[PDB]
Amino acid sequence: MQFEKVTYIAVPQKYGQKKVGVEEGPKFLEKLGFMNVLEQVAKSVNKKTITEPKTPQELGVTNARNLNEVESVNIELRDTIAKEYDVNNLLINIGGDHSIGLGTIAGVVKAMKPNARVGVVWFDAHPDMNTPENSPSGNIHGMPLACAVGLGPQRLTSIMPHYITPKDIMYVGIRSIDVGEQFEIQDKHIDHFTAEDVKRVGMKEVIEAINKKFVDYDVIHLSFDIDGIDPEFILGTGTPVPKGISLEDSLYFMSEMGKMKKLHSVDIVEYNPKIEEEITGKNVLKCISSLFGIK
Amino acid sequence: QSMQFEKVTYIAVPQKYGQKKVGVEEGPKFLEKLGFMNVLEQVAKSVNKKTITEPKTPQELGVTNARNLNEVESVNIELRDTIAKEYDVNNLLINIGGDHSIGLGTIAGVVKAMKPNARVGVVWFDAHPDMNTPENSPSGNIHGMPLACAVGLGPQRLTSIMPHYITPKDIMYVGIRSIDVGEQFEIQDKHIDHFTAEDVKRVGMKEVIEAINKKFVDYDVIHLSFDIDGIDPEFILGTGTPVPKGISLEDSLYFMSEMGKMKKLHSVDIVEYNPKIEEEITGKNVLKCISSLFGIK
Ligand SMILES: N=C(NO)NCCC[C@H](N)C(=O)O
Ligand SMILES: N=C(NO)NCCC[C@H](N)C(=O)O
Ligand SMILES: [Mn+2]
Ligand SMILES: [Mn+2]
Ligand SMILES: [Mn+2]
Ligand SMILES: [Mn+2]
Numbered sequence: 001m002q003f004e005k006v007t008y009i010a011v012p013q014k015y016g017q018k019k020v021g022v023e024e025g026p027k028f029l030e031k032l033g034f035m036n037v038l039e040q041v042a043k044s045v046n047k048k049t050i051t052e053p054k055t056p057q058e059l060g061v062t063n064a065r066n067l068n069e070v071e072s073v074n075i076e077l078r079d080t081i082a083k084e085y086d087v088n089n090l091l092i093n094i095g096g097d098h099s100i101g102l103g104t105i106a107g108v109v110k111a112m113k114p115n116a117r118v119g120v121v122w123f124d125a126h127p128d129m130n131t132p133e134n135s136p137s138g139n140i141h142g143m144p145l146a147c148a149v150g151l152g153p154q155r156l157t158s159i160m161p162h163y164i165t166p167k168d169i170m171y172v173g174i175r176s177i178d179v180g181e182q183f184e185i186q187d188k189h190i191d192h193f194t195a196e197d198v199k200r201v202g203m204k205e206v207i208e209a210i211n212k213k214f215v216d217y218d219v220i221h222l223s224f225d226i227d228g229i230d231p232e233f234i235l236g237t238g239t240p241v242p243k244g245i246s247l248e249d250s251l252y253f254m255s256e257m258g259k260m261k262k263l264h265s266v267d268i269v270e271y272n273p274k275i276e277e278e279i280t281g282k283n284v285l286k287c288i289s290s291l292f293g294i295k
Numbered sequence: 296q297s298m299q300f301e302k303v304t305y306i307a308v309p310q311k312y313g314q315k316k317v318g319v320e321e322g323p324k325f326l327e328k329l330g331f332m333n334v335l336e337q338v339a340k341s342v343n344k345k346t347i348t349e350p351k352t353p354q355e356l357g358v359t360n361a362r363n364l365n366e367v368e369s370v371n372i373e374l375r376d377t378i379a380k381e382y383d384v385n386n387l388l389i390n391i392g393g394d395h396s397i398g399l400g401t402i403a404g405v406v407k408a409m410k411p412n413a414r415v416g417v418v419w420f421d422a423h424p425d426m427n428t429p430e431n432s433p434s435g436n437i438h439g440m441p442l443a444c445a446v447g448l449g450p451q452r453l454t455s456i457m458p459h460y461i462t463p464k465d466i467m468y469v470g471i472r473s474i475d476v477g478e479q480f481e482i483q484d485k486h487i488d489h490f491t492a493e494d495v496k497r498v499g500m501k502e503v504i505e506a507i508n509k510k511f512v513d514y515d516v517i518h519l520s521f522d523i524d525g526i527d528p529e530f531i532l533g534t535g536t537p538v539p540k541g542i543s544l545e546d547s548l549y550f551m552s553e554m555g556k557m558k559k560l561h562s563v564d565i566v567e568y569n570p571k572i573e574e575e576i577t578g579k580n581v582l583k584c585i586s587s588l589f590g591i592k
Contacts, residue, residue, distance in 0.1 A: 010336075030332045036324050039307075039346050047332070047342040 005044040007084045007091040011077060012052040015069035016099025016141030018059060019238045021274025023052060026094040028273035032281040034094070034288070041090075041292045048084065050076050063132035064153060070140045074103030074159050081107025087219065087264050092288075095269035097238070098128055101144040101223045102159055104267045108221050110161045118164060119214040120145075121257065123172045123250075124225035125195075125241040127181040134180035141270075145169065146184075166190045168217075170210055172253070173198065173228035176241045195228075195244050203249045207256040214262060222257055223267040226284055236280030237270045247283060254290040266291060297590020298555065302341040304381040304388040308374060309349040312366035313396025313438030315356065316535045318571025320349060323391045325570035329578045331391070331585070338589045343381065347373050360429035361450055367437045371400030371456050378404025384516070384561050389585075392566035394535070395425055398520045399441035399456060401564045405518045407458045415461060416511040417445075418554065420469045420547075421522035422492075422538040424478040431477035438567075442466065443481070463487045465514075467507055469550065470495065470525035473538045492525075492541055500546045504553040511559060519554055520564040523581055533577030534567045544580060551587040563588060 010026035026034075038045050053069040077093070077100060085091055085108060093104050101122075108118055122128070122145060129146045132138070132153060140156070147156040150163040157163070166184065171192035177185070185192060191213060193206050214220050227237045230244030245253070257263060271284050289295050307323035323331075323346075335342050350366040374390070374397060382388055382405060390401050398419075405415050419425070419442060426443040429435070429450060437453070444453040447460040454460070463485035472492045474482070482489060488510060490503050511517050524534045527541030542550070554560060568581050586592070 027330070027333050031328055031330065033324070033328065035327050035332060035344070043346050043348075045344040047344065049336050049340050049342075051340070 003042045003089050005046055005089050006038050006042045007086070007089065008038065008045050008047045009050060009077070009080060009084070009091065009093045010047065011050045011073065011093055011096040011100045013050070013073050013096035013100050015053060015057065015066035015073070016097035017139045017238055018057065019272060019275070022095065022097045022238060022270060022272040024273055025096055025271035028277060028281055029094060029271065029284060032285055034285060037285060037289055037292070037294060040294050046084065048080050050080065062138045063135060064140060065138045067140070067153070067155060070099045071155050071159070074100065074106065074156070077103030078106040078110055078159060081265070082110035085111035085265060089264070091265040093265070093267040095267065095271070097141040098124070098225050098269045099140040099144055100269060101128065101267060102147045102156060104223065104265065105148050105164065105221060106159045106161065108219065108265055109164070112218065114162065116219070117217040119168055119170070119217040119220040119262070120164065121170045121172060121210060121220060121222045123222070123228045123253070125173060125176050125227045125244060126225070126239070127171060127174050127177055127185065129181045129184050130178055131180065134178065136178065170213055172206060173245045175243060198245055198249060203252050206253065211260070217262065219264055220260060220262045221265050222263060223269070224287070225270050226268065226287070227270055229283070233283045234280050236272050236276035238272050238275065247286070250287055251290040254287050255293065258291040258293055296337060298338050300339045300386045302343055302386045303335050303339045304383070304386065305335065305342055305344045306374070306377055306388070306390045307344065307346045308370065308390055308393035308397045309347065310370050310393035310397050312350060312354070312363035312370070313394035314436045314535055315354060316569060316572070318569040319392065319394045319535060319567060321570055322393055322568035325574060325578055326391060326568065326581060329582055331582065334582060334586055334589070334591065337591055338387070345377050345381070347377065359435050360432065361437060362435045363437070364450065364452060367396045368452050368456070370397065371403065371453070374400030375403040375407055375456055378562070379407040382408035382562060386561070388562040390562070390564045392564060392568070394438040395421070395522050395566045396437040396441055397566060398425065398564060399444045399453060401520060401562070402445045402461065402518060403456045403458065405516065405562055406461070409515060411459060413516065414465070414514040416465055416467070416514040416517040416559070417461060418467045418469060418507060418517060418519045420519065420525040420550070422470060422473050422524045422541060423522070423536070424468060424471055424474055424482065426478045426481050427475055428477065431475065433475060467510055469503055470542045472540060495542055495546060500549050503550070508557070514559065516561055517557055517559045518562045519560060520566065521584070522567050523565070524567055526580070530580045531577050533569050533573035535569050535572065547584055548587040551584050552590065555588040555590060
């Protein structure tokens, strides 16, 4: 039950937010042995590197910071995924900030027929459903799921071949929610477990709910923001939020997601090794290992 | 910088069975730890990595003329066949070892990838000629035999890995300085082209490169097999058989830079890094050599 190949896309993207270092996520996971983890799962790894923009960061007040760089990266990412996505193998995107989630989901959508049903599990402290009109920061990493459902600037929403819908989303771990996001979650009845919910009901129930929700879907895509995890375990990340998912629960979650036959693509985002390298990187590699059944 | 390809093929070859020390099978893993993939990122947006199966059997540590023959055979066959599929005259293939017994598989693979009438040139950068046979080997370690096997001198199970043999006229040695009785015989009897490390010091690496360019004009492709113990032990400590009075790091970097400019070079082996002997100084100097090959300083 081993794969013929893993497609590994490194996405050195920082322009969805303001802190330097998140673009070196892939390079530092490699340093800590990511390729050796992939070696236990496939003899062939096809690595792709998305071009890193090199322009000066826009660090002032704006409603949509460094839109050119988020657009260019997400388009390249979408088109690379569209070509490499394969229901018999595994695709792993390593970020980079969570603005790349627009590109990853667009790419899965592009790879499938127009009538396909694509499910998204979004493991995160944040719903990432703000727009430039309500964003508290102007940081596009807080907007990708809004763009994916068609709420956002044209330059970004048009990256989607067509929109997913709020019924396609399952949140896991959310706990830092803005006014506009609370409105969307309640108004559109978006399925979710907050971190408190997880603590109360257990991760076994979360997995059962995911299995039931996506039973009639064609594929599932997992987008795993490491800041979903409690900051005791994950320090090297730009927006840590207390009272997160335990590492034990996160490993179980990844292990169970990895057994889902409809899952063929996973994003691992928001590792900033310049904030903290070793404890964080090693816990990230545990999560990835657990996804693959290693540990 | 300098070198851009559509793709690099990277084959990790975790082979220790050509010799007796543990750790040389972890060469690839430790070069990755030190940033090998980031080096490849400067050269291509696509890297196709393959990993050759690591055997897990006990090392054969008694008296024999050809130690762990099953494990060297198995790895070299898989290596040959993987290279045969991925070898490409418009891109680059890099095999990271692992001990030098893998040089039989790498050369066989280049030969298999080409037409049966192709002329394949080999530059062998090494302290050792690696042209012993089981009958004259002082150790029974197959890492000292691959070039003998490639020219058809060796046990059938290894020589038959070659689709056809290369000949001693196809070889250029650089850096050789530790030579056994049987290797000295082959070098002088077959007039094998070489520069010893002392030769290099006397004539300069510029002359070595010119001789390589001139020799391989008649050939279709060149394959470089780079044993890090060619380099002086001041710079390369993490290796199983270090030999003093080696090629300077400066000359080795120049050598790699110039090899990388050769249009006929489409495949390179980097062998004999044993990080369990010494990890950091060695690994970082190995990555400099690889970087220089690609034009990065
Ligand atoms: N770490 C990222 N993605 O999960 N956080 C994004 C949202 C932070 C905050 N809600 C904002 O829009 O500024
Ligand atoms: N370091 C490796 N690859 O060059 N081999 C060295 C062999 C030493 C000696 N000639 C022997 O056959 O045992
Ligand atoms: Mn996120
Ligand atoms: Mn987040
Ligand atoms: Mn050698
Ligand atoms: Mn040697």
